[PDB]
RNA sequence: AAUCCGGUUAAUAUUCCGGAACCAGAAGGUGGAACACGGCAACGUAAAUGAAGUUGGAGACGUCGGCGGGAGCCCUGGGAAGAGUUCUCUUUUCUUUUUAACAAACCACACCCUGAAAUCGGUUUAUCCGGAGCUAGGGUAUGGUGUUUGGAA
């Protein structure tokens, strides 16, 4: 059969997103399902992170710290390649810093 | 609703003061479904043997309200 | 020849990423459980804090306390460095039995932590003891 | 220049060489890499990474004028090579050059 | 930030009823937890101190095309119930045959480890990947998914 919106809001938009169900009473209805979550992304290079769920921030607040972080330095905010990039940079330019300071002294 | 498989834990949820009522269901496959109503979750236990169905029934504390086939 | 016992290196990945460790033993020849250039190295998971004279003795000891961690790392995953620390205690104390037995591993970690604390008190290997910012 | 390219071709034809970054890093760690060539178009981070390992392992480092494609064409392979190492020069005398 | 199913009225239903869940805030009690560990690693756990200060991400986003998946509708076989047809042939014709939110476990695009490739290999419907590591093997994570159950007959 033919269904109607559950809410009083017509005009299917970015927030008026619906899904068909078959009820236990053999009736077809809409459930206004919500916008899907997106995994947070890397600030260093932009690739989305790995190992953490795709959610909206409000149900991020319900997650646990260990479901949230990646157990490493700069984790949860930088990716594996990003944290690799920081540490190799950290090493090579202090090598460069110490060699030039030996040159000047 | 949580599905509980370990018998003893279902006993210890029943002994917990949060438990209010338990339901006994007889299915067509001769499985009995012990459905314990708790505050947040409905814990269900499916035991296949009819006699473990019975020695479970009175091992439930008498204060808890058991209910026949719902 | 670049990898020898007592050579200080840095870890590139894992939980202890960007951490300075000392190569206790080299197994570059390979092993059944470790079929690569795995080297057992003990590093510091919590670098010692800045000790203040005005601070109490207990606070200074807590700040100087270093929690070590001994683990195997790949040659590719390890970054060699110029500095080297010839720790007598952290030389040959790591073996297959130490890695397998948990109690032996805990005892080895405690011994390594004690050696690191003694080195910090003596003021040796300052570069290795000081954490490196990324 | 041209003599270096000719020596590199002779080394690739006779001696042992690894035209790969991971292979060169392994050779540098083992200390068997006498000489290494780094493409000009290679990223500065990778170039410095190879330079630090070369200095630690006491290995000669030469910066090729051409890019990765030019280095691959000089090596004769069908794919561009950003870095290469020559463990043995064979008949070539590129170790001195 | 957060609700679904069934029923109820002459007139109200995601609001009332019965059942089953979710979110936010607030304090405590009991038990377990001890400035924690195990995995070389892609990580993981019931816990796994964080005063100030510093920092980033999600939220936070255009348009077209193809591909594959799912859900509902449509088509359809076997079976079951009811109704129509009949001397004849028709195991016929028509109607009905349902499983919500919410939970639990299990369960492949990206990454890593071993590996070091050309004899160039893998490989998209639509030739891209690779000396910035190939094929292969083994893991890692987002797991609408369905694989069963709860709800729930």
Curated annotation (Swiss-Prot), chain A:
The keyword Ribosomal protein applies. GO terms for molecular function: structural constituent of ribosome. It is found in: Cytoplasm. GO terms for biological process: cytoplasmic translation; ribosome biogenesis. Pfam families: Ribosomal_L34e (PF01199). InterPro entries: Ribosomal_eL34, Ribosomal_eL34_C_sf, Ribosomal_eL34_CS. Keywords: Cytoplasm, Ribonucleoprotein, Ribosomal protein. Coiled coil: none annotated. One of its GO terms (cellular component) is cytosolic large ribosomal subunit. The keyword rRNA-binding does not apply. There are 2 genes for eL34 in S.pombe. Belongs to the eukaryotic ribosomal protein eL34 family. Component of the large ribosomal subunit (LSU). Mature yeast ribosomes consist of a small (40S) and a large (60S) subunit. The 40S small subunit contains 1 molecule of ribosomal RNA (18S rRNA) and at least 33 different proteins. The large 60S subunit contains 3 rRNA molecules (25S, 5.8S and 5S rRNA) and at least 46 different proteins. Component of the ribosome, a large ribonucleoprotein complex responsible for the synthesis of proteins in the cell. The small ribosomal subunit (SSU) binds messenger RNAs (mRNAs) and translates the encoded message by selecting cognate aminoacyl-transfer RNA (tRNA) molecules. The large subunit (LSU) contains the ribosomal catalytic site termed the peptidyl transferase center (PTC), which catalyzes the formation of peptide bonds, thereby polymerizing the amino acids delivered by tRNAs into a polypeptide chain. This is Large ribosomal subunit protein eL34A.
UniProtKB/Swiss-Prot annotation, chain B:
It comes from Schizosaccharomyces pombe (strain 972 / ATCC 24843). One of its GO terms (biological process) is cytoplasmic translation. This is Large ribosomal subunit protein eL38A. Component of the large ribosomal subunit (LSU). Mature yeast ribosomes consist of a small (40S) and a large (60S) subunit. The 40S small subunit contains 1 molecule of ribosomal RNA (18S rRNA) and at least 33 different proteins. The large 60S subunit contains 3 rRNA molecules (25S, 5.8S and 5S rRNA) and at least 46 different proteins. Keywords: Cytoplasm, Ribonucleoprotein, Ribosomal protein. Belongs to the eukaryotic ribosomal protein eL38 family. GO terms for cellular component: cytosol; cytosolic large ribosomal subunit; preribosome. The lineage of its organism: Eukaryota, Fungi, Dikarya, Ascomycota, Taphrinomycotina. It holds the Pfam family Ribosomal_L38e. One of its GO terms (molecular function) is structural constituent of ribosome. Gene3D superfamilies: 3.30.720.90. There are 2 genes for eL38 in S.pombe.
Swiss-Prot record, chain C:
GO terms for biological process: cytoplasmic translation. GO terms for molecular function: structural constituent of ribosome. The keyword Protein biosynthesis does not apply. Keywords: Cytoplasm, Nucleus, Ribonucleoprotein, Ribosomal protein. InterPro entries: KOW (IPR005824), Ribosomal_eL27 (IPR001141), Ribosomal_eL27_CS (IPR018262), Ribosomal_eL27_KOW (IPR041991), Ribosomal_eL27_sf (IPR038655), Translation_prot_SH3-like_sf (IPR008991). Signal peptide: none annotated. Pfam families: KOW (PF00467), Ribosomal_L27e (PF01777). It is found in: Cytoplasm; Nucleus. CDD domains: KOW_RPL27. The keyword Signal does not apply. Belongs to the eukaryotic ribosomal protein eL27 family. Component of the ribosome, a large ribonucleoprotein complex responsible for the synthesis of proteins in the cell. The small ribosomal subunit (SSU) binds messenger RNAs (mRNAs) and translates the encoded message by selecting cognate aminoacyl-transfer RNA (tRNA) molecules. The large subunit (LSU) contains the ribosomal catalytic site termed the peptidyl transferase center (PTC), which catalyzes the formation of peptide bonds, thereby polymerizing the amino acids delivered by tRNAs into a polypeptide chain. There are 2 genes for eL27 in S.pombe. This is Large ribosomal subunit protein eL27A.
Curated annotation (Swiss-Prot), chain D:
This is Large ribosomal subunit protein eL30B. Keywords: Cytoplasm, Ribonucleoprotein, Ribosomal protein. It comes from the Eukaryota. Belongs to the eukaryotic ribosomal protein eL30 family. It is found in: Cytoplasm. Component of the large ribosomal subunit (LSU). Mature yeast ribosomes consist of a small (40S) and a large (60S) subunit. The 40S small subunit contains 1 molecule of ribosomal RNA (18S rRNA) and at least 33 different proteins. The large 60S subunit contains 3 rRNA molecules (25S, 5.8S and 5S rRNA) and at least 46 different proteins. Transmembrane segments: none annotated. GO terms for molecular function: RNA binding; structural constituent of ribosome. The chain holds residues 21 to 117 of 117 of the full protein. There are 2 genes for eL30 in S.pombe. Component of the ribosome, a large ribonucleoprotein complex responsible for the synthesis of proteins in the cell. The small ribosomal subunit (SSU) binds messenger RNAs (mRNAs) and translates the encoded message by selecting cognate aminoacyl-transfer RNA (tRNA) molecules. The large subunit (LSU) contains the ribosomal catalytic site termed the peptidyl transferase center (PTC), which catalyzes the formation of peptide bonds, thereby polymerizing the amino acids delivered by tRNAs into a polypeptide chain. GO terms for biological process: cytoplasmic translation; rRNA processing. Signal peptide: none annotated. GO terms for cellular component: cytosol; cytosolic large ribosomal subunit; preribosome.
